[PDB]
Symmetry: D2
Amino acid sequence: PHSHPALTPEQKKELSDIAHRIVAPGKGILAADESTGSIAKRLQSIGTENTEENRRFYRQLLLTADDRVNPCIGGVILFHETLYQKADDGRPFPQVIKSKGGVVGIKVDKGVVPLAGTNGETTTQGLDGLSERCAQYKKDGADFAKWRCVLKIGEHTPSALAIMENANVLARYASICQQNGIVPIVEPEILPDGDHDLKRCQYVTEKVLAAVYKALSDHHIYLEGTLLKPNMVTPGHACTQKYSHEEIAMATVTALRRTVPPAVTGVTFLSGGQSEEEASINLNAINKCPLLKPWALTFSYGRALQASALKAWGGKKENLKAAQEEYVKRALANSLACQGKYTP
Amino acid sequence: PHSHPALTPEQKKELSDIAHRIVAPGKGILAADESTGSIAKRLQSIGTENTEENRRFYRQLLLTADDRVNPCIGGVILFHETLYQKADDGRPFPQVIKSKGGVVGIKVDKGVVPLAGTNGETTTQGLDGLSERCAQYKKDGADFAKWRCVLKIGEHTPSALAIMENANVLARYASICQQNGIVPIVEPEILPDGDHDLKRCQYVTEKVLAAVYKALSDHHIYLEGTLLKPNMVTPGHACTQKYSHEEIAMATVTALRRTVPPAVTGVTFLSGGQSEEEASINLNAINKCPLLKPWALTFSYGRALQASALKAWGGKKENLKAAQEEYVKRALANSLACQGKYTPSSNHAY
Amino acid sequence: PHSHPALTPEQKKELSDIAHRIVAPGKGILAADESTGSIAKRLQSIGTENTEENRRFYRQLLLTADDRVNPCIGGVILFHETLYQKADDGRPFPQVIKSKGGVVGIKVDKGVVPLAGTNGETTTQGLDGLSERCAQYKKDGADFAKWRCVLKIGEHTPSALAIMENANVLARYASICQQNGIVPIVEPEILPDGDHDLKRCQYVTEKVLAAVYKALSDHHIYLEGTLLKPNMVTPGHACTQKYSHEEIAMATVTALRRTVPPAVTGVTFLSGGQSEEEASINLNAINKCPLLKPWALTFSYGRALQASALKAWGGKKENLKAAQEEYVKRALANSLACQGKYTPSNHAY
Amino acid sequence: PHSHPALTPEQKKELSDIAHRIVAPGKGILAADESTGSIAKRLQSIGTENTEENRRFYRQLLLTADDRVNPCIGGVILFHETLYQKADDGRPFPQVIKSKGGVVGIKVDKGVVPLAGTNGETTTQGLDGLSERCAQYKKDGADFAKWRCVLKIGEHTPSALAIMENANVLARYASICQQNGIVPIVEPEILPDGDHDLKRCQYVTEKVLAAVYKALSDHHIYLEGTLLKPNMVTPGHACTQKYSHEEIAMATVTALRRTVPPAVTGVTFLSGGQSEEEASINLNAINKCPLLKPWALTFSYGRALQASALKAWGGKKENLKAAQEEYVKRALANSLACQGKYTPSGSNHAY
Ligand SMILES: O=P(O)(O)C(c1ccc2cc(O)ccc2c1)P(=O)(O)O
Ligand SMILES: O=P(O)(O)C(c1ccc2cc(O)ccc2c1)P(=O)(O)O
Ligand SMILES: O=P(O)(O)C(c1ccc2cc(O)ccc2c1)P(=O)(O)O
Ligand SMILES: O=P(O)(O)C(c1ccc2cc(O)ccc2c1)P(=O)(O)O
């Protein structure tokens, strides 16, 4: 019952200012932090070899798009390798991001691991030496981080253990980040896999998030210096029933209103399995929902910003401009969506 | 991880409609739910005998104040006895309240009891037969309820046990109320007793409220059909340091923003040990605080609405108009305060 | 992290002494604490009218059985009404129990109530004014109490909420009891209803008991001054897979060994739906189980001590002795069973 | 509310057999798992250079003691480095341990880290890639592991957060170990630092252990395949009041009886700040305590087995037998203590 402040007022101000820059009006996050094993599949899908150069080039493609994205992109999440790579003009990618008015983010988790005694549930690892890494990332231009936990809706999942453990590791990660001047993005993703309906997803999302913010409270996390990256509330991929974008928006905003304290600076939705357009329309519906929403509601999109660019590129240097144009298309669409002004 | 809905959509709409009516803009709650043993202290302090009639008359005095209070009072909390009493003209008090545009509330807890193994901490009892009582109260005109838990800031308090137990009993009470169409007011009062400073109170309040809303989630409570009745964040009574109303306001709004989900319909502050004027000024500062507040921020005042009326009355029938006038003045002041329009005459430091 | 002792050494000794008397070797508990609504069903089943007199008479029948039961019965749980009734010789029943060497117990809970938002799960009420009632019961001869929580094995039950809520109310009840010199019997009964198998019951029992004793710890309960009244670990009533009494015993003792601190003075099993004989055989197997058991393992039986006596009585005054003889028969059987003296792959668990 | 078994019957049997071998009657654990940075302090204190060779030689000194220790030592905990070092005859140290009838253990945690928002409290790290490490250690001869959490008794500590977090990380570590056939030693150490009295330590130990075993339950840990390594219940170092060994034993055994399920195979006490002799006397008092104790009560001693041997050695090879002799002497003393048979010649409700 005694306060031993985790953060000084100066530390708090820094975190809050960073968090606010990332989700400033009209702005969202480009998620380009695919691990080498994850980006491999994407290159493979356009018949491109998974080399450091192709990864460097593709990231350059995204990060060096014209200045039309500048007001659309408040932050860019990088994977470790990309943080220390350079553009053709010799500029480190973090410098490229900052020069276009963006904040640099770093994915810091080390993937999921199985929870014994559960039906295929996982927790996430990556806490070991995390404090030193965060200090180093901070020096090298990073101001926020990402940590992904994954939960599954099934007959017996997500279990009490899975919810409790994932909420706890998220809280530990968030605590270490804030000690090093890094804004943590808390990502408790509930997968869309399954035949569950919308209100089951809403129920699970509400329970997961209540657990998350209790955990953050127990660990003395400064919410104004954090962001939330949740799934939208949607039916499962195999659900036959159909819902309008307004119903999805209503269920999403409702779940958040019942669990997310106003002090949280912003919510940066993941797109999950949604198409580029679907992701933009839902985000727009969410921002048009008439209920009171005391946090920024924007995007942290990977696929939903990149899918078309990757295809237009096709691994061919000459299609650079064509590819970039597709990315700018989505960045502009989503900058409008997070203001509720997007009309396809 | 499977939903067995506690409430149907219609039950939800009813609770939500009630909750919103109580804290509509400019409106707050008159807390007149003092137990017979509690009102005894009030009457004795003005040299008046504690009889059922004097209790009936005093409550009548408040409930029949002129129509200037109508837009000020969205709800009135009554103690059991008063719910079944009548005004001089034969009208049941609940009818008196409703005809003036108010919602009728009922205090349903049965007081604090000691928690063994703690430094003088308590939980609250009153769950036994609560469902039957609530159904009966609902039938008899009550639409919301009050349940008071008490926590104290000390060297080793509030303990983990006290916080967990009180949050859990509050959630049980809220669940039972909502099954019977009653809106529960959740009151986790942190007493002002002690020499703690403002930021100690803010810390404890944040921890208490986080535990409260985790418990409400675990018990499947419909937040849109609830109200919160917390202490304002203030220094302890014995704290020598001094604070402005703006700091009190900032600390209060900050604690709430960090713990109370937007879905909560409203926050109805208790006045605690504050004077009538102090309570109004603080509530006004809270509503002027520039930070974003996604819930109604209003009052659930007992002493802060009644203190002057009670004194002007003095147990004498002939002081009716003078006494009622004091009550109306405070009702008017607080209706302005809960809109941030009352006149008595940002920082990451929190 | 600071101690504010709930009990003095003297209070502790009293509670511990009581707990040990109740479960002394060879002894168990007669559960005669059926509420008026529950005993109604039994009287009805033998075509007897549910009157205060028939209830008084039936209870008298059990409490005044001959001295062969004295070493068998360490405790008798009564319902409120019975606590204040008298035998034909004018003696209050508590005095009748004590004179036969028994400890007097009182059921203090006020029944189950539904938990909203769950699939038919309940918690238990009865905390209001419980401290005053306990103080009064203590004056009137009661030295221990009973509080029954009920949990159900289903597709989505027992839920996290149900386990947490029932464990917490049990802890509150135990705390209040110990403040008033009453030994609380903690009964988190997991019902046998359903077609679940033995290891599901063992799993649920292990999880419930872990929750119970964490709760008891959080509420500063003095375990040496408590008793546990759990279900035995058995398959569901409708389970098609068959088990031996040795497997039931192994699963039961394993579950307890994994959850029940040694400091707990005794385990007094409820018989549930088991027959009189089945209850005795299982209890005997439990005590024969070769694993180490650091608590007394005995009985708190209602049906398993009374079923035959009730039928033999049949509501006829003249059948008193015949009825009593049936009860004595079961008391003797279970007194042997709780010593492992009754004759009618450990890692697989 | 549905079981998805973490372990098969065969996995359970393996873990149980290992746990039982380690704490068989008369046996305890030699804790020789001091990290390179921790062992540095011990060598410096005897004016010896902290080199890999000197560390190898010193560990060799302990592990190759004569066969009088064989019935005394059920297990030996090694630090990573030592697990892959060899004796002079080319034998890997794990084989030396096994040939003397001992089980091989490995410390797998990566030290404490600060918990933000607390008064100097910590949790422990080391879970990352722990499964892979455990699989490798198993392959390389290790059958059990050690993970140390540290809690401190102060005015506002151990806090709820500290207790919960450390209990939870211990449960994660135990879960991963058991998936890889490794018996986890659960060590929730409450430091003796401070001026608190005996009953404060007993109170805190009881609360910590209750949290530990709830956490282990939540994470589906197989208790029969675990060991507990707790502090004894003692007053703080700076406590002015004095207590007998009988009182220390009573408080220690009482705390365990109130929290540790019978299914736990054994309790291997840490000696903490105790002298070699004090550690043996207390352990002996614990085993003579008349209360019922349904688990093995033995030792997992570092300093209390090594202190005298290390000084007698002084870093000089010619003092080998003398140094070993001091180690053997403590091993024999503690083998007797964990049977309640140790002699220097060789109210219950108050708690
Ligand atoms: O065909 P692909 O390359 O897998 C493509 C896709 C899928 C996931 C992606 C994830 C990313 O983070 C970035 C780009 C992606 C692109 P989609 O599945 O949307 O067609
Ligand atoms: O003379 P008292 O009884 O102390 C008076 C007082 C105190 C507490 C009160 C509490 C109430 O709920 C209603 C009226 C009160 C009136 P105050 O302290 O405000 O003068
Ligand atoms: O015919 P009944 O009343 O159901 C009879 C019975 C059943 C439950 C009983 C429960 C008791 O607590 C005491 C006596 C009982 C007696 P049984 O079913 O065992 O024959
Ligand atoms: O002089 P040192 O090296 O500090 C010695 C000591 C202290 C702690 C020790 C801890 C160990 O794990 C193994 C040996 C130790 C030896 P002590 O303090 O007992 O004399």
